[PDB]
Design a protein around this ligand. Sequence first.
Ligand SMILES: Nc1ncnc2c1ncn2[C@@H]1O[C@H](COP(=O)(O)OP(=O)(O)OP(=O)(O)O)[C@@H](O)[C@H]1O
Ligand SMILES: Nc1ncnc2c1ncn2[C@@H]1O[C@H](COP(=O)(O)OP(=O)(O)OP(=O)(O)O)[C@@H](O)[C@H]1O
Ligand SMILES: Nc1ncnc2c1ncn2[C@@H]1O[C@H](COP(=O)(O)OP(=O)(O)OP(=O)(O)O)[C@@H](O)[C@H]1O
Ligand SMILES: [Mg+2]
Ligand SMILES: [Mg+2]
Ligand SMILES: [Mg+2]
Ligand SMILES: [Mg+2]
Lengths: 87, 361, 76, 50, 372, 262, 173, 328
Amino acid sequence: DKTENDIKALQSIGQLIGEVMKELSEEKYIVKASSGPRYIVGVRNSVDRSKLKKGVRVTLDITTLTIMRILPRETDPLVYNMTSFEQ
Amino acid sequence: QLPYLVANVVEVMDMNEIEDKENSESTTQGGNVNLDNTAVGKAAVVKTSSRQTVFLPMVGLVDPDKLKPNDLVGVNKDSYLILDTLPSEFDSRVKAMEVDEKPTETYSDVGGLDKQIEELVEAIVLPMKRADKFKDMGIRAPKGALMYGPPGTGKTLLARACAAQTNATFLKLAAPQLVQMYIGEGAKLVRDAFALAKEKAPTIIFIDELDAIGTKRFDSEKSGDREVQRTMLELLNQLDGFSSDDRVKVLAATNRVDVLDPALLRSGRLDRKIEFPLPSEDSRAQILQIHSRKMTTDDDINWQELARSTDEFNGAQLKAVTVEAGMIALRNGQSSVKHEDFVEGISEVQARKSKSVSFYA
Amino acid sequence: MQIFVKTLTGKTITLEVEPSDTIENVKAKIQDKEGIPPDQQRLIFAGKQLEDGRTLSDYNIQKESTLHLVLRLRGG
Amino acid sequence: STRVEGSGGGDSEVQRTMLELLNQLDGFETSKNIKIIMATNRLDILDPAL
Amino acid sequence: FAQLPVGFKNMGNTCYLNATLQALYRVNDLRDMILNYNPSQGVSNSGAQDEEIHKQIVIEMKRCFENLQNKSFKSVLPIVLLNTLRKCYPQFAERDSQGGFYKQQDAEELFTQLFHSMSIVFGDKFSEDFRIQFKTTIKDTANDNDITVKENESDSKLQCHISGTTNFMRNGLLEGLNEKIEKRSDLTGANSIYSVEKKISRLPKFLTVQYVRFFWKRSTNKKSKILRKVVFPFQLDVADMLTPEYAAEKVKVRDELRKVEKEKNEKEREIKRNESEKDQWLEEYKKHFPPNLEKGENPSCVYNLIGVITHQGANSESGHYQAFIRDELDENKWYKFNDDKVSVVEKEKIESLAGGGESDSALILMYKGFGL
Amino acid sequence: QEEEKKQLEEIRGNPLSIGTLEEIIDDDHAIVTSPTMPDYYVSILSFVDKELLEPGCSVLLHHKTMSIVGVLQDDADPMVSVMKMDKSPTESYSDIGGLESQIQEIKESVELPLTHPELYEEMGIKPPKGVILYGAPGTGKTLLAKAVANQTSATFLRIVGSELIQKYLGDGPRLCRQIFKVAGENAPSIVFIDEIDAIGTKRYDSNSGGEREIQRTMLELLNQLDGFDDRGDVKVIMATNKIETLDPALIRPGRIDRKILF
Amino acid sequence: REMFAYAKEHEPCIIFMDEVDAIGGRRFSEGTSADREIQRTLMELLTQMDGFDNLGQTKIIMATNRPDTLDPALLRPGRLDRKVEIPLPNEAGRLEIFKIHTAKVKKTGEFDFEAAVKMSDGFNGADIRNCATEAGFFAIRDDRDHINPDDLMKAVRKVAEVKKLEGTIEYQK
Amino acid sequence: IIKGKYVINLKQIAKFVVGLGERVSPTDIEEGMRVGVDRSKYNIELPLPPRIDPSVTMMTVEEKPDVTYSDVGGCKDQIEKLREVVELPLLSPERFATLGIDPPKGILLYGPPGTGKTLCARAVANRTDATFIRVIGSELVQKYVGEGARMVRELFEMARTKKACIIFFDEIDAVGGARFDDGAGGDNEVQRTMLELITQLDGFDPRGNIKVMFATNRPNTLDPALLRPGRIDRKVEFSLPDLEGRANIFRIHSKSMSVERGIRWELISRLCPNSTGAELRSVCTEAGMFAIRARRKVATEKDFLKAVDKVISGYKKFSSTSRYMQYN
Ligand SMILES: Nc1ncnc2c1ncn2[C@@H]1O[C@H](COP(=O)(O)OP(=O)(O)OP(=O)(O)O)[C@@H](O)[C@H]1O
Ligand SMILES: Nc1ncnc2c1ncn2[C@@H]1O[C@H](COP(=O)(O)OP(=O)(O)OP(=O)(O)O)[C@@H](O)[C@H]1O
Ligand SMILES: Nc1ncnc2c1ncn2[C@@H]1O[C@H](COP(=O)(O)OP(=O)(O)OP(=O)(O)O)[C@@H](O)[C@H]1O
Ligand SMILES: [Mg+2]
Ligand SMILES: [Mg+2]
Ligand SMILES: [Mg+2]
Ligand SMILES: [Mg+2]
């Protein structure tokens, strides 16, 4: 099972994060990526319109660029080092 | 096998394992009952050195007790999945601070000025090794010991001699090199010089020349000394106690003790303050005899007579007498250093020709 | 017969062989324990090469001797 | 504020370079076309090379 | 216009021979003996029928060298010699698939085989000229219970074994003439670690040192080539690898010769503002050579650099050897032999061949005895 | 012509990716850093003569695999734009006429060794190098410099001395160091520094100018005038009238041979 | 920007800026290009604190090593409502600090602090803790695991001698 | 280095773990060393010399000027002091192993202007056959402070890898001068390179066969931590010519000049005050311009007198005729 779980991750692919910059139309969303350049991208029926608001991180695929799911916010690798000072 | 990218873990957010009826994610999914529909396993977000972040289902083979929001990992380039964990990165200039079979110079290259040595051993070496007694005593560790006094006194040479002699790890670091105009990553040279050191502890960070990051000023106007001090403050951050300065130490040599920062006057930064004097009567004679140990000498010499005609010279000036004795011997056409030529090397080099034409003095 | 073979990494290992045995046996035995293939091996003694068709008594090769092993390289 | 004690103005340094090119720039295609029209509150703050 | 020697035109897949020959002919006794060959030179008789093939090879060098010295010529043929070598050793006579023609390997091996042939023809007395004799003490680590002294161990060149111990040639020579032998034999114990120190007991009059560049990677199971920077001094002193006794003898002669060498280097520059002048100095030099000198021995412990074989490009499995030799008339003037492309290069070009990288780097260094 | 281009284009592009040459290696290789980004470990086709190129050159790389097809020679910078002439004087000599009794120490050390090397062969030793002109203004110095240039037909650079003062620090010496390397590249040049008393009175702000900026540029110009370099023939013309704001290492005779009073 | 956002995601997040001097400094901009990063970052702080974002949950502690090093917008209270002075200790305020560090040490009992500490003046609070450390260097000299009054009165005296090296004169408003 | 693969930074910055191919061994890769890797799959293809930052440490390296040692500047005993510190341990370390002393390396060339300090390091550049690296101290300062710190370190460690070289620190009165603290100044950025000069020279080991000459044209601008003589061994003041030394210098110039012999070179030294060695170098060239007016091939006795007067009135008009920039 330790290697079966690795198979399942391996035959999958990564996601590339964006956030909803501006709603354009029903099935078209404008995002500004965390890597930069803005796109227009689509949605599956794996997400709702009432479940998206702006500044909410969204997944995209790196082979079709379509949102499948809602993603929690991000927060610096740097600011986690500050919470580890308490001594 | 190769290739595989090197990355850091932004954060871990963790989705549920596949054992529920309603998704295996912490987030909510458009559409209900799903368990393998569009809901995925445990998750970590990592930042690639191709400069993006990728949200991946992390490999079940890599235990999630290995991931930290600040840890360096392998990622398979072709399809981005954590392959493995790897130790943390260090910058190339920081990897050569280490020893590589550093030679020792031990106390056999030092004659005269024993008191200095004693203070150094007590400050640095023994709180490392006798670190239990220190807790018994009920006091906090030293963050470093300062060395100061005029140029040529012997500071640098001590530092090397003792660190190699006792086998405490000697990091070779020079102050201006931390000042870089990459600042933020050049300030991260400072951060990594402590990062290496906390793994390589106990360790001695010998910073040679402490008047670049030991500047008096931190009120500067309309100049680029406001770039300079931002690598000074990061050092003072890693000498504030969130430990990682409790066995990680600092030696510092400085030639000017007039411009040291007020946040380095205070103890908790540099604690022990070692003065290096002008040598006494007896001490000068010992110093000469250490340089003369290596070379041939005649047995008609007397170091006390030589110490009369030297008036409170320090150690650089005395090295320049012992080598100049043997300059003269080659020049006459011998190879035996005459006992008379010490006398002529004192006058030949004082680090000054004559005392500058007298006409009313 | 015990002989010594100085490898490419300049460390001496021993080898157990015979003075009647051919150089092809000598090289086969180094193949078993290091992995090096005979046709890239060159066993030297006295500054003179010991070819595959030679043995270990043609040049008076007895025990407590060290052969110096160096490797081939192609081109022209 | 130390360039007006330092050079008569830091803009007078650029003006002074300009004017010296123009002393022998009378022919480049043969005749002058590009004139240097300088202007200031009063001309007591100008450099003696202007 | 000006006098310059001729080179070999590479047939292709032949440079391993062409490159090596040039370096050898710089050596003063080498070129002499091939010229003054008679079919009456005493052989090391114990029988053997390949003594006769060795004779034929030495004739081929003689005529190659006659072609080389004389200008009625711009190319020296290796073809008759190639045919003799392929008869002699049937490893060069195979056939590559998808590449082509006659098997190509190995300037090191080739110098070894050439000296073997010459020593049969010109006797064991000629063998001593490049041959080095050691004093080997094989002795346990701690107290000795088993000891053997070998002088019958011998070589005709040094093997500088790189293991990442080189930044200078001397270090790696010193750690490959120093070694630990592990045993697999029964004593009254077994697997005793012996310290072995070989020291030179007889200097050659001509020194060769080869860098070892190859490795068998065992972690991938494929041949790689070591790449490293090793500075080689033009003026090589082997004092520390001799025993105290032998070092004492050669270092005292060396210091007097360095006085006369200094005196020449001053006089040369003045008269500027040649062969005969060197001979007037030679007659002065030979007077400080020891009266106990023997055959096949340098009168000093110092050697000067007359050849570098460089190997360029990618992997081993591939190679086009060009070479550098020093002029026979000069001392800081070097000829680059890139097959038949012969050119003058300087000291700076020789210095650059320390290597590391896909660039030219050293495999073989030829020196010779007598400082100057 | 027909057979030459067939086998020339076989390795020469279509697009020829530009590189900048960092360093060569002596095995017929180099390591380039491209202005586009990626470095490359390039070979060299080597019909451009391996020893004919050197760091700072702009190089032609091949678009299949990056090999040095060739090397471009002749560049221009925004820093030699300032130096180069944008006119050719239209007032030629003796439009400075009058005060012509000490024009004989500027037409027999500046013009002449170029015109006759013959007369300086008879005496042999070093020719005259340099003049400094000084006097009150209105003695024609600035055009005199541009008029002896007409006669010799040697590359005349002209640089103003208020452009050797910059409002940034450390990059001043770097600009001045350039000026003479350009000049020696032309085998004959004349460099006129207009107002070399404008590097010892002029400053911008005091935290990137000040005494220090002035001080450094004087010291730099010593090495350029002579120092170690041993460059080609540059005749130098300096016009100044404040000759006490300079190093006492340039206004000594033995560098700027005759000094002329007007 | 993301640090103030994070503080709003995390009730009662308290932010210590440690050693601000040259990341919240003045306009400067006649030196390096580095000085324009200072501004850029400095605006960020004020826009979070005040605008259509206002913090009452969530607190700022600004620690600076010399008061007059900062931009005047950081000298404008309303983001920074209190400018609290923490003194260099008083005569008998040194006694207060000495008593907390004499419970960190192992000792044989000491209650003779007051006279010596009152007139050993010249100390900041970290030098009380370094007088502890120097008494533990005197202690190791005598071969002790303990602090005694024979260590103590030498400790305050020594640390005083070495602090004559240079002083600290900085304006206190 | 990860011990048994390595972490590289591409120059496209992107980091990768790479292995070992078939041209590379276990021991070929070092810290901060460059390696070339393959673009389809990242693996060490060819090891490479360290550090691509060098390009302006290569504009201070040039090959040697071949000026003779038979025409030099200053005809005193001052150049033989150079021949014991700089020149001889490069030629022969054998004598300094017999003495048993740590060989002598450093020397200061300091004193009056115009005394041919650069002429003797060019003269030595022909003779020793040792690579010369010549430095301008004023090219070491950059607008963006911290850049020249990098610069110095890179040159000096690279030079320990070279063998038998001389580094001529020229014009280091800027960086290498005085040190002082300001309150709102802008001098401090420059001092960074000053500090880096102290710490590379002294090292954490001593110089690996680097003989150092420092040319200061004022003996009044030197860091007080190179003023100490332990790293700058015997230091020889190049001063203005003596009354016998000027006669010698003028004789080298006039053997090289086409003249009529029967001209006193001693007389010419008398008319002169004590003054630079460069004045006598311009007596001949002005006597050469009087040759052409006179219509000669030679310079004769008379016109040297005119030339001598020209330069002397020049020094009267200026200064540094007995100045040291104040205070020997
Ligand atoms: N007590 C001593 N005995 C023998 N030699 C000494 C002694 N003190 C100093 N020296 C010699 O004087 C030299 C100069 O001192 P050193 O350079 O080590 O210290 P420093 O004061 O940090 O100088 P800098 O900062 O200028 O490098 C030493 O390297 C050593 O050769
Ligand atoms: N003595 C002169 N005889 C003839 N024309 C002169 C004289 N002096 C100056 N001029 C003329 O004045 C104009 C500018 O002079 P130029 O700039 O060449 O001289 P300068 O001596 O460098 O200083 P300035 O410009 O301050 O006069 C030109 O038209 C030039 O011909
Ligand atoms: N002693 C001398 N003998 C002959 N010529 C000299 C002498 N001194 C100086 N010169 C001439 O002066 C020219 C420039 O001098 P150089 O550049 O060596 O200056 P320097 O003596 O190092 O002084 P500074 O540091 O003040 O610039 C030389 O090329 C040379 O022709
Ligand atoms: Mg030091
Ligand atoms: Mg703090
Ligand atoms: Mg004018
Ligand atoms: Mg100078």
